[PDB]
């Protein structure tokens, strides 16, 4: 029944995309609010933004009043598409990389280092095909009417390639990869430590997710702000250079802009994926 297995894997893959699509679409408005607050200083420099966002509520109000309600899903297609090339790469190469750099968990230290190498390589290899979509997501979520900078998703690609080339599409690759490693190490480290300590299960997952993402957030900020420099006259000479200039100009706190908005996005995604699981449990067997 190899053919039946092939059909099973095919249905599992496609329906997985649907689950991911709904989850990301549901928490899409809060996601754009995060991206707006996070890269507002870049917009102010570019002249796209008039005044700094006073907060999450202020971001919601201004965006809704100036652009509308549908504008909160601007860039969402990138998140929808990104599933298939990611998971295809996931199901193909992730296990081999784990078999290449991994050590049996039954020493913790050697397993920890192995997980970083495996997670880093898998993340980087996936980003080679994926990163362009995340870039377009951020840029579409960023450009606003004061006269939009980009007409659409594919418009981003055309204008970025015409100005910077393929390099412009991969702005902030290094701090993204490092971010993946740091996030993963923090995730697994925190999870195993709090493991011996369902509502309890859901709360546990939220704590680890919040902690790991918060500490690795400055890396995410630098990544997104480097995406903003694509097609612009002035650009940072690296993530470290970007990091240095941010602190010297706006302070350390500027690296954590939109962090709280990101936490809200997390509980929204986790929330709606649980709801859909129950809905899926009723319609389909699994």
Give Cβ neighbours of residue 215 (< 8 Å, ≥ 6 apart): 182, 186
Contact call for residue 75 and ligand CXT (CB under 6 A): no
Alpha helices in 27-75 (DSSP H): 28-38, 40-46, 56-66
Q: Are 117 and 101 spatial neighbours (Cβ–Cβ below 8 Å)?
A: yes
**24 annotated to a ligand binding site:** no
- Select from 58-66, 138-146, 147-155, 175-183 the region that touches ligand CXT (CB under 6 A): 175-183
Helices and strands, number each (H, E), in the chain: 13, 0
Q: What 3-state class would DSSP assign to 109?
A: helix
**94 annotated to a ligand binding site:** yes
Contact call for residue 83 and ligand CXT (CB under 6 A): no
Least distance CB 169 / ligand CXT (angstroms) = 15
- Select from 36-44, 59-67, 122-130, 232-240 the region that touches ligand CXT (CB under 6 A): 122-130
Residue of 29, 75, 114, 123 interacting with ligand CXT (CB under 6 A): 123
Q: Which two tokens stand for residue 142?
A: 């960023």
Residue of 48, 63, 216, 230 interacting with ligand CXT (CB under 6 A): 216
Instruction: Find the binding residues for ligand CXT in span 151-170 (CB under 6 A).
Output: none
How wide is the angle at C-alpha 147 spanned by C-alphas 146 and 152, nearest 5°? 120
Contact call for residue 142 and ligand CXT (CB under 6 A): no
**82 annotated to a ligand binding site:** yes
The single-letter DSSP state of residue 73 is G
Diameter of the chain measured on Cα atoms:
63
What element of type H or E holds 15? helix 2-26
Contact call for residue 127 and ligand CXT (CB under 6 A): yes
Chain mean position to CA 31: 9
Size of the site for ligand CXT (CB under 6 A): 21
- Select from 63-71, 192-200, 218-226, 250-258 the region that touches ligand CXT (CB under 6 A): 218-226
Residue of 180, 190, 255, 261 interacting with ligand CXT (CB under 6 A): 180
d(CA 235, CA 165): 14
Phi-psi region of 11 (alpha: psi -120 to 50; beta: other; left: phi over 0): alpha
- The residues of the shown chain that bind ligand CXT, judged by CB under 6 A, are 86, 90, 94, 119, 122-123, 126-127, 130, 175-176, 179-180, 183-184, 187, 213, 216, 219-220, 223
Binding residues for ADP, as ranges, are: 82, 94, 223
Binding residues, as ranges, are: 82, 94, 223
């Amino acid at each position: 029944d190899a053919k039946q297995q092939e059909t099973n894997f095919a249905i599992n893959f496609l329906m997985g995309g649907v689950s991911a699509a709904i989850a990301k679409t549901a928490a899409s408005p809060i996601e754009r609010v995060k991206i707006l607050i996070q890269n507002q200083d870049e917009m102010i420099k570019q002249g796209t933004l008039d005044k700094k966002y006073s907060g999450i509520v202020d971001c919601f109000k201004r965006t809704a009043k100036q652009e509308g309600l549908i504008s909160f899903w601007r860039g969402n297609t990138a998140n929808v598409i990104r599933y298939f090339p990611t998971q295809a790469l996931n199901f193909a190469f992730k296990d081999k990389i784990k078999l290449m750099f991994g050590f049996k968990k039954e020493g913790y230290g050697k397993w920890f280092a192995g997980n970083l190498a495996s997670g880093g390589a898998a993340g980087a290899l996936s980003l080679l095909f994926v990163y362009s979509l995340d870039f377009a997501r951020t840029r579409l979520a960023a450009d606003a009417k004061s006269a939009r900078q980009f007409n659409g998703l594919t418009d981003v690609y055309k204008k970025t390639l015409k100005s910077d080339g393929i390099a412009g599409l991969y702005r902030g690759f290094m701090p993204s990869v490092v971010g993946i490693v740091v996030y993963r190490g923090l995730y697994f480290g925190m999870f195993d430590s709090l493991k011996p300590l369902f509502l309890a299960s859901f709360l546990l997952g939220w704590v680890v997710t919040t902690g790991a993402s918060t500490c690795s957030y400055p890396l995410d900020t630098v990544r997104r702000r480097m995406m903003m420099t694509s097609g612009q006259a002035v650009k940072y000479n690296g993530a470290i250079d970007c990091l240095k200039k941010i602190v010297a100009s706006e302070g350390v706190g500027s690296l954590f802009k939109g962090c709280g908005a990101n936490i809200l996005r997390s509980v929204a995604g986790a929330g709606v994926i649980s709801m859909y699981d129950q809905l899926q449990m009723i319609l389909f067997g699994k």
